[PDB]
Design a protein around this ligand. Structure first.
Ligand SMILES: CC(=O)NCCc1ccccc1C
Length: 185
């Protein structure tokens, strides 16, 4: 792909983070802590899952960023509406305001309803995410495999400002402690 020139500098919004997450000083990396991280609760924090939003809000244009997922067993990545539900149980779907892919139990799936099987021959260490607001497109690229397409959501009905979306996943196995990292331009 040739989307690299729409690169945007994404930073994580502490205030949206699940209370167990640890965000680096530069706001570019996030990982699951072993316990509650000693912050007060607020209506923005994701309660049920280890999720956090980027600070940036997009309502027009073309945006591109990259995320490092090296040695993780489980994660969700993409974009969501600024007004997605924060508390309780919910599914990642466009009906609920999410345009995402994930890794879970050695398979990759797109967050459609119901979910769609992805066909990945080279497990990615870094994912590229492209959003075209006007066209209603969210695309995912395998940076490890020369930028090969993973999945395109088209005819997206964003219905609001968009925010970058992250889930570091649980670490019940002891094999999923590694961080998500926003990769430099
Ligand atoms: C997964 C696990 O066993 N967590 C341990 C967290 C804990 C609890 C009580 C005292 C000290 C620690 C580190």
């Amino acid at each position: 792909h040739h989307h690299h020139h729409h690169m945007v500098h994404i930073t994580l919004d502490r205030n949206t983070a699940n209370s167990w997450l640890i965000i680096s000083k530069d706001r570019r990396q996030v990982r699951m802590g072993d316990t509650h991280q000693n912050v007060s609760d607020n209506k923005e924090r994701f309660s049920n899952y280890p999720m956090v939003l980027g600070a940036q809000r997009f309502s027009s244009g073309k945006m591109y960023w990259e995320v490092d997922v090296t040695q993780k067993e489980a994660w969700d990545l993409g974009v969501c509406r600024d007004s997605v539900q924060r508390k309780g149980q919910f599914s990642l779907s466009p009906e609920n305001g999410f345009w995402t892919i994930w890794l879970w139990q050695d398979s990759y799936e797109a967050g459609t309803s119901p979910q769609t099987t992805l066909h990945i021959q080279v497990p990615p260490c870094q994912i590229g995410i492209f959003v075209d607001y006007e066209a209603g497109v969210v695309s995912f690229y395998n940076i490890t495999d020369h930028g090969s397409l993973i999945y395109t959501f088209s005819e997206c009905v964003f219905a609001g400002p968009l925010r970058p979306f992250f889930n570091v996943g649980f670490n019940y196995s002891g094999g999923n402690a590694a961080p998500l990292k926003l990769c430099p331009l």
